[PDB]
Amino acid sequence: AFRVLKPWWDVFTDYLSVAMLMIGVFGCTLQVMQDKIICLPKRVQTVEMKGLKTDLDLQQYSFINQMCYERALHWYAKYFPYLVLIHTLVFMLCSNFWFKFPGSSSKIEHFISILGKCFDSPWTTRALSEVSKKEGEQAKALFEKVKKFRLHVEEGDILYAMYVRQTVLKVIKFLIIIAYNSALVSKVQFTVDCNVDIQDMTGYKNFSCNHTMAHLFSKLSFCYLCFVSIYGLTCLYTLYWLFYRSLREYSFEYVRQETGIDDIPDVKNDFAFMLHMIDQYDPLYSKRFAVFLSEVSENKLKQLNLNNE
Amino acid sequence: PAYRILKPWWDVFTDYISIVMLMIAVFGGTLQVDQDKMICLPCKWVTKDSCNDSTGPTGIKYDLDRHQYNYVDAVCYENRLHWFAKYFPYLVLLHTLIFLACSNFWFKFPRTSSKLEHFVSILLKCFDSPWTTRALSEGVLDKKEGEQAKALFEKVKKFRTHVEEGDIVYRLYMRQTIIKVIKFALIICYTVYYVHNIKFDVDCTVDIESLTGYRTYRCAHPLATLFKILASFYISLVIFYGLICMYTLWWMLRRSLKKYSFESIREESSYSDIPDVKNDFAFMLHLIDQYDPLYSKRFAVFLSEVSENKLRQLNLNNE
Amino acid sequence: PAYRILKPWWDVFTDYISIVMLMIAVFGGTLQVDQDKMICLPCKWVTKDSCNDSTGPTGIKYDLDRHQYNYVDAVCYENRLHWFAKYFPYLVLLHTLIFLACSNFWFKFPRTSSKLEHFVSILLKCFDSPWTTRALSEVLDKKEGEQAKALFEKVKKFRTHVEEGDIVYRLYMRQTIIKVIKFALIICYTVYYVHNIKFDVDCTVDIESLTGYRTYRCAHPLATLFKILASFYISLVIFYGLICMYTLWWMLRRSLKKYSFESIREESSYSDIPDVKNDFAFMLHLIDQYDPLYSKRFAVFLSEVSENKLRQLNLNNE
Amino acid sequence: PAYRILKPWWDVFTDYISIVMLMIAVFGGTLQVDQDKMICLPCKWVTKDSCNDSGPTGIKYDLDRHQYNYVDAVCYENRLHWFAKYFPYLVLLHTLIFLACSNFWFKFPRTSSKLEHFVSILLKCFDSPWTTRALSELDKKEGEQAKALFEKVKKFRTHVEEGDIVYRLYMRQTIIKVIKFALIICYTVYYVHNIKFDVDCTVDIESLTGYRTYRCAHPLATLFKILASFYISLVIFYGLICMYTLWWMLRRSLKKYSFESIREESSYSDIPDVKNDFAFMLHLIDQYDPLYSKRFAVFLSEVSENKLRQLNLNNE
Amino acid sequence: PAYRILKPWWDVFTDYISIVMLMIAVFGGTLQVDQDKMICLPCKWVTKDSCNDSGPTGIKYDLDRHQYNYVDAVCYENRLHWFAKYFPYLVLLHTLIFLACSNFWFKFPRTSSKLEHFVSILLKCFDSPWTTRALSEGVLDKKEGEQAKALFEKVKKFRTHVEEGDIVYRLYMRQTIIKVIKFALIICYTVYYVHNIKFDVDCTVDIESLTGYRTYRCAHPLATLFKILASFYISLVIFYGLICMYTLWWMLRRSLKKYSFESIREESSYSDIPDVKNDFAFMLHLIDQYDPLYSKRFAVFLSEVSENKLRQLNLN
Amino acid sequence: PAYRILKPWWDVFTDYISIVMLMIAVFGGTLQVDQDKMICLPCKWVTKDSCNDSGPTGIKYDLDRHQYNYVDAVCYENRLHWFAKYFPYLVLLHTLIFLACSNFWFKFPRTSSKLEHFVSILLKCFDSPWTTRALSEVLDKKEGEQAKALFEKVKKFRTHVEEGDIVYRLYMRQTIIKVIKFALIICYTVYYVHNIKFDVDCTVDIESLTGYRTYRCAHPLATLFKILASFYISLVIFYGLICMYTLWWMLRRSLKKYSFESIREESSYSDIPDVKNDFAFMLHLIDQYDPLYSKRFAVFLSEVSENKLRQLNLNN
């Protein structure tokens, strides 16, 4: 169960990344076959109009097309889809930066297993009814498991640091992408002027060329820019939610407002951050898992077990 | 897969219409990528940048190379051919993507997806439970069967407290339906207004007289009639999608989906303590009724505490 | 998957014919998209908008550019090629999709899909139930008796929930009528317009100001192939007609909303099996059309004498 | 699939021949679709409608590219034999009919249900532990399952021994396959020599082009030729296999399966002779694996069922 | 799958070589279909109907594009060697023959059924807990004891059933022989005809009546690429042949129709395991060439002493 | 899959890099087949067989389209450097060799069987509840018998695997071959990447057929092959670095000696023996995937655990 730890921003950025992949693949397959330039020499040799004869073979025309595609067309207009592909692959690889390192993955699996196991445990409902046998032994075992989890996760804060590094990397990459794409989006134009020196072959020096797939590339660039801007707004909201509230401290006072138990300790660092994650999924798991943390609940369960036995 | 119970007939209709519209998008996109050309022929005699249209017949010699013809084609395709004919498949594909995202947003939003999966699980394993059959039919029960029956009873008990308080699923489905209907309105306005601009014969006047020698060219867009019939088919499919979405909106408006009465269930069955459910739980129960009412018929068994007392008595007798 | 037992020979045949029609639709669509051209040559001897068709031989100089030829091809393909020769594969694809939608709307409509799924589950459970074998024979375990009684109550509840109406039968009827009507319309229009897929087409498009010639004679290279496709399609539709027509006869010769268990009640020991009606009768008729054994051994779960014997056996081991 | 037991070597060999016949049909189909053209050059020195030919320099024909394309299309349509054009579609149709004849056994719901239920009882008898110990000549649950399976086997025997629909359908499929193999061989052998590289065309488009007769070269001819030859060889093999299948259905009566050696080897000598469809699928199983029929024959014997009730009675 | 156990290192190596050659055959076939042409320029200077070829200005040939296409097609069909045109199709056919020879062992119903029976009860003997109990050298479950006794009887029955005939070993030997002869013929003809794949091809096709020139010089675009593909195929065929000769030497090294259990009977307690013969010996040699643990775990069922320990422990 | 546990981080990183390399090779090969050509123009003014380079009007070459195609083909074949022509095939071959070297560990039947047995018993130990009890340190009879059977299986597995070091040797050989291949690939590719240029001058001497000797051409997919090579080299470097790390991981520690001193000090059972050779090697790889599997498998190795299980079963 890994999708539970993914909030709305994480899946939103993932689907944005799939959209970016589609845009990059479409741009690449357009650039492989449809991308061509059409060049005509300048100053060439009831009104009856007559066409101008350039006295050029088809091979000379192809040669001019190539010289102007290489030495006149802007590199952005030729390598935009590959840049999109590379940048979105880097985005996809860094999308699960906080999911793939084995220690953090083990912490994720341990926390979700614990939270699901106490979710399935009826002792939570029994304790919530009390405040407002075999399963008792299972609840005691789950409680000592919760204490072991406290001794295993709460003292560290590596998960929060990895998440903040991933978010900062996404934001800085988005800034770079917006900057260079907005700077070079004006270079993708239909009519270009090509001044290569192939006069010794074709006889002309100045050419006017048309990038046939320039309107489509401009629309694709603007769509990719829109997707990048949405991705960056999502990452900026992620950073704002990261920073404006201290996620190294999880407070159970909102549970205390309606639950009488007050011996509940406040967890910190990794526990606090990933409980905030589960709150972002749904606060019910957090306000329900509150009852498994305090020690007077364990003492009450021990007394109940002693009375029952 | 497991969400097929939560998709009524309108959702299935819209899903298949979206599939056909996406097929139209892919077909038009491939055609516009491969064979979308614009064969342009210059007008020999012009009067104020307009073709005059003025012993066997002989061909008109234009003195134009193949590459000058290609240049004229590119210029007039870029400049004079209407944007709708050029970007019809891409706009269609974008609209299909928006429609599919709107339809499947609540299946991907974690806050509603968790509730939806919980509801689907505890209603299906409710449906195949033997206690439902034995209760609706109205000494000894299997130990595993009895423990499972009490486990699903407690699971329904906690699910009711977990879902009835909130209305996130109902509000999300409202917002998705409203966005889909306004998107249909926008599409059926702009596509219908601009569908008449996909013409076979287009005059182009692009001022490339210094590179070609002519100013006006009578072009011909080959995939204009085919794009026209594709646009008409797309308009028909969007009309069907919009009518289905307006039916969904009318269904959601007339009956308050934030309340659900088990009066029909509690009268036919002996159990008359089934409570009236509200908010999101009521909404997905209404959706399940739209799929198959007998699922909710069996699900109402676990909602009555008289059934709880009977199950507790039977389990105590077995114990 | 588990709906094969609900698909008779006519349904399977129509599915495979629809698959073949989809294949020829895709083939013709690729041909039309890629290699459908129209080689048009001007008629230098024009006689009142008609080709006059009138010392080594030398080719006739037309003084036309390649782009003028392409323009002539495009205009005479757009204006003078018949709409059938251009949109035959797309129409075939549309008709095949209509046929597939008519066939699968039975299983896609949520009410009838739920009813059919419930029927399939109950009938498969009764098929795999061991008591039915004993019901065909005339010991039993506590578990087998418990599950057989539970399946008896499940069958009774399923019968109560299904035998009320005939939404499945009405849907199958409506799909059959729509398929027959579609076959009739397809045959009429295709047979009427198949003669317009010709190789040599004379075009008169009035582009004299742009080309210099008025009348041209064009060759449609794919036309004969399309003709060989079109007749083939007609043949398939003919088959798709007759099979469907047989279905209509099978749905009108006898009332499918009344299933009689007379043979099963007279061969088996239990002679009290009641005659089901409406949707239950229709799905049992279809199931008999697949294999009579399914309905024959499902009949024991509808007879009250079998329930009495099961209750006696449960009292014995109780 | 689940019916692999019912398919002998002839059924599986012809299926692989049908697969490769499908592949050269696909290979020919895209070849014809993409680059099946013919380059037609007019014969300038026409002499009794021929090409007499009555440093060197090229011969100027004064023909545009589009006139050449028109000549190509017209002579391809008219003076090219229909076999050289529609050989891949004919091959595709023939292998589709062969595959339909092979799979109509499993697609027809009556025979499909009969085959399915036979295969189910046969495999479950294979998994039955009773048959091994009976061939050697018991738990309470194992004996009860075997008795219920014995009832299932006798009920199946009563259900299938009445009719011979499966055997008749298989005979009809073999008849259609062999008669279509014959027809394919005759017409393909007769018309394979019409796939020529060099073809003379005379289509009378002198009013448009200027020449009466044009000499055409068909590029995808010789390759098509060898494809046709390859196809013929495959069909030949197919037919030979079908011939043996016909032999297998005619040298012995398949509607009567004799257990003479089966009851001779085993202790149970009361095993009856089955008939009709049961005999046919038992012959098919013998063709695949004699062990399945060998350990299935015990559940047809009343003596072994007598050994079953005493074992159950002694256990009780 | 279930048949990977009976595939030694030579078999899997030949399978990987086969799919690699299939890949290069598909690549060459796609290349032949799409980009296989030949650009033919007429020789303006001729000598006895041969290409003399004795601010520069380009030579004017006065040939249309269609005459050039006709010259290309005619010289391609006539004066281009058949190897340079049909090399990928020959490679595809040879690869298909090799794959059919490798997989006919798995497809023939008699041998496939025998292989399935062997693999099935080898897996069952692996799953048998008494295999572990015997290999270690207490308390026996009733179901476990019944399964062990049934497996022992099945082993005895199957050993009697297959040790009579060696059709599987004979089929495998025939497949190896056919593969090595195929490799010999392939390497001989491919080595002979690889030098005919040339770039510059002088064609004399006698189309002076239509084009006006007699001899032409052609460039084959996919000539050296096809030569590289031919050399790669030669290397792959050499590797396949060396593997096949090693496999044949494995057959001829020792009698695979006679397996001796001497080492296992010395290592294990049971020293009465008979020296089995023919098809069982070959099938055990194959799993010994995959993993000797299979023979170690399966030899306990053959021995009668383990059956003597079985009957004593079952009685207890 | 089932063997993901054996693969460390460096192995899966090399697998992903090789997949990306295969994608690059497929893209380059597709471009090479489809749109990789040469288009060349003659040098009108030539002095000493070299381009003199001595409103405006177009230069008339008097060359047909077919003469241009011939010039293009000859200057592509003779004067384009072979690296620019066959770079996609070279990266294809190199990636296939890398993939074969990586998968030869799981392909070779002996090492594949050993790895399958190791993975199966490790997975069975990982889910064993007796392992959980031993970590915790009253059990079911069948649970205790399963624990005893797994103990005996561990003993016989250790005796089976500790005799040979083929698995570690094969992994060492694969790593060495990968490092050497990386070195050769980097050396030749860095040496020859500069030959992929856009402007190439060709002197092919076809003056007899065309009329010119020297032509200057332009390779369309040149500067796109100059980035595809330069991106590929980077991956190879990364690949090599990863492989180099793996090589370093072989040299600092002895992979044939897995000392359990760290585990037995922490655990109560301080009598765990040190394993050797292949078993030590796969236990070290288990540590590289996740040490928890080796920690759980360690309790099924000590003799004190065997005594405790025997005492528990005696109480049971």
Residue A261 makes CB contacts below 8 A (sequence gap 6+) with A131, A291, A294, A296, A297
The domain limits of chain F are: 9-315
CB half-sphere exposure, D143, CA atoms < 13 A: 17
Q: For E9-315, which CATH class?
A: mainly alpha
Residue E135 burial by CB count (10 A; 0-12/13-18/19+): exposed, middle or buried?
A: middle
Q: How many residue contacts between B and C have a Cβ separation below 8 Å?
A: 99
Give the mutation candidate from C37, C38, C68, C77 for the B interface (greatest B CB count, under 10 A). C68
Nearest to B127 by CA among C113, C127, C118: C118
Nearest to E243 by CA among E169, E180, E172, E168: E180
How many Å apart are CA C46 and CA D208, to the nearest integer? 12
Chains F and E touch (3+ CB pairs under 8 A): yes
Which technique?
cryo-EM
Sign of the CA dihedral with D123 first, then D129, D133, and D138 last: negative
With contact defined as 3+ CB pairs under 8 Å, the chains touching B are: A, C
Is F2 touching E (CB cutoff 8 A)?
no
Residue D4 tokens read as: 């692999």
Q: Report the gap between the CA of C163 and the closest CA in chain B (Å).
A: 14
User: Could you give the C-alpha distances from F61 to A202, A207, B81, D128, E61, in angstroms and in order?
Assistant: 10, 20, 37, 88, 13
Q: Which residue of D has its CA nearest to E43?
A: D56
| End-to-end Cα spacing for chain D | 41
Residue B138 makes CB contacts below 8 A (sequence gap 6+) with B270
Q: Do A70 and F223 touch (CB under 8 A)?
A: yes
Is B8 touching C (CB cutoff 8 A)?
yes
Distance of alpha carbon D285 from its chain centroid, rounded? 20
How many Å apart are CA C41 and CA E303, to the nearest integer? 90
Residue C272 tokens read as: 């009290």
Nearest to C36 by CA among D73, D89, B198, F34: D73
Contact A117, A142 (CB under 8 A): yes
Buried/exposed code over F230-261 (b: 16+ C-beta within 10 A; e: otherwise): eebbebbeebbebbbebeeeeeeeebbebebe
Kindly report the number of other CB atoms within 10 A of residue E162's CB atom.
20
Contact E29, E64 (CB under 8 A): no
Q: Do D109 and C9 touch (CB under 8 A)?
A: yes
CATH superfamily to which D4-315 belongs: Gap junction channel protein cysteine-rich domain (1.20.1440.80)
Chains B and E touch (3+ CB pairs under 8 A): no
Question: Residue D5: helix, strand or coil by DSSP?
Answer: helix
Question: Residue E51: helix, strand or coil by DSSP?
Answer: strand
Question: Residue E46: helix, strand or coil by DSSP?
Answer: strand
Q: Using an 8 Å CB-CB cutoff, list chain E residues near F108.
A: 9
* Residue count of chain C: 318
- What radius of gyration, in Å, describes the C-alpha atoms of chain C? 31
Q: What are phi and psi of F42, to 5 degrees?
A: -70, 150
Contact D291, D131 (CB under 8 A): no
User: Could you give the C-alpha distances from F1 to A108, A109, F5, in angstroms and in order?
Assistant: 22, 20, 9
Residue C218 tokens read as: 């064009």
Residue A203 burial by CB count (10 A; 0-12/13-18/19+): exposed, middle or buried?
A: buried
User: Could you give the C-alpha distances from A191 to A186, B11, C227, F160, in angstroms and in order?
Assistant: 12, 47, 46, 75
How many Å apart are CA A77 and CA A184, to the nearest integer? 9
Question: Residue C41: helix, strand or coil by DSSP?
Answer: strand
What does F171-238 look like in DSSP terms, one character per residue? HHHHHHHHHHHHHHHHHHHHHHGGG--SEEEEE---TTTTS-SEEEEE-TTSTTHHHHHHHHHHHHHH
How many Å apart are CA F297 and CA F123, to the nearest integer? 9
How many Å apart are CA A38 and CA B74, to the nearest integer? 8
Nearest to B296 by CA among B284, B308, B312: B284
With contact defined as 3+ CB pairs under 8 Å, the chains touching F are: A, E
Q: Do D212 and C52 touch (CB under 8 A)?
A: no
CB half-sphere exposure, E17, CA atoms < 13 A: 23
Helices E109-127/E167-193 angle, 10° precision: 120
CATH number of B2-49+62-318: 1.20.1440.80
Kindly report the number of other CB atoms within 10 A of residue A51's CB atom.
19
Q: Do B220 and C45 touch (CB under 8 A)?
A: no
Q: What are phi and psi of E63, to 5 degrees?
A: -115, 135
- What radius of gyration, in Å, describes the C-alpha atoms of chain A? 31
User: Could you give the C-alpha distances from A151 to A268, A297, B212, in angstroms and in order?
Assistant: 12, 18, 82
Q: Measured between CB atoms, which of F34, F40, F56 is closest to A43?
A: F56
Q: Measured between CB atoms, which of A46, A52, A208 is closest to B52?
A: A46
The enclosing H or E element of B95 equals helix B83-103
The domain limits of chain A are: 3-308
Contact A185, A84 (CB under 8 A): no
Is F107 touching E (CB cutoff 8 A)?
yes
How many Å apart are CA F16 and CA F32, to the nearest integer? 24
Is E31 touching D (CB cutoff 8 A)?
no
Residue C16 tokens read as: 């495979």
Buried/exposed code over D103-142 (b: 16+ C-beta within 10 A; e: otherwise): ebbeebbbbbbbbbbbbebbeebeebebbbbbbeeeeeeb
How many Å apart are CA A61 and CA A58, to the nearest integer? 5
Question: Residue A121: helix, strand or coil by DSSP?
Answer: coil
Is A11 touching B (CB cutoff 8 A)?
yes
Q: Which residue has the tokens 């220690």?
A: A103
Q: What are phi and psi of D285, to 5 degrees?
A: -65, -40
Amino acid at residue number E309: K
With contact defined as 3+ CB pairs under 8 Å, the chains touching D are: C, E
| β-pair type (B45-46, A47-48) | antiparallel
Look up residue A31 and give its DSSP letter.
I
Q: Which residue of D has its CA nearest to C36?
A: D33
How many Å apart are CA D46 and CA D48, to the nearest integer? 7
Contact C251, C282 (CB under 8 A): no
Distance of alpha carbon F110 from its chain centroid, rounded? 21
User: Could you give the C-alpha distances from F163 to E55, E265, F159, in angstroms and in order?
Assistant: 81, 20, 7
What does D73-117 look like in DSSP terms, one character per residue? HHHHHHSS-HHHHHHHHHHHHHHHHHHHHHHHHHHSHHHHHHHHH
Is E1 touching F (CB cutoff 8 A)?
no
Q: Using an 8 Å CB-CB cutoff, list chain D residues near C64.
A: 64, 66
Question: Residue C224: helix, strand or coil by DSSP?
Answer: helix
What percent of chain F is helix, strand and coil (3-state, nearest 5)? 65, 5, 30
Kindly report the number of other CB atoms within 10 A of residue E308's CB atom.
12
Contact D220, D31 (CB under 8 A): yes
What does A30-69 look like in DSSP terms, one character per residue? IIIII--EEEEESS---EE--PPP----HHHHHHHHHHHH
Q: Do D217 and E33 touch (CB under 8 A)?
A: no
Contact B279, C98 (CB under 8 A): no
Residue B312 tokens read as: 């507790």
CB half-sphere exposure, C279, CA atoms < 13 A: 21
Q: Do E59 and F210 touch (CB under 8 A)?
A: yes
How many Å apart are CA D210 and CA D62, to the nearest integer? 9
* Residue count of chain A: 309
Contact A65, A36 (CB under 8 A): yes
Contact C162, C89 (CB under 8 A): no
**D166, D167, D168, D170 alpha-carbon torsion, rounded to 10°:** 90
Strand partners, C203: C216
How many Å apart are CA F101 and CA F108, to the nearest integer? 11
What percent of chain C is helix, strand and coil (3-state, nearest 5)? 70, 5, 25
Q: Do D210 and C137 touch (CB under 8 A)?
A: no
Give the mutation candidate from F13, F24, F59, F63 for the A interface (greatest A CB count, under 10 A). F59
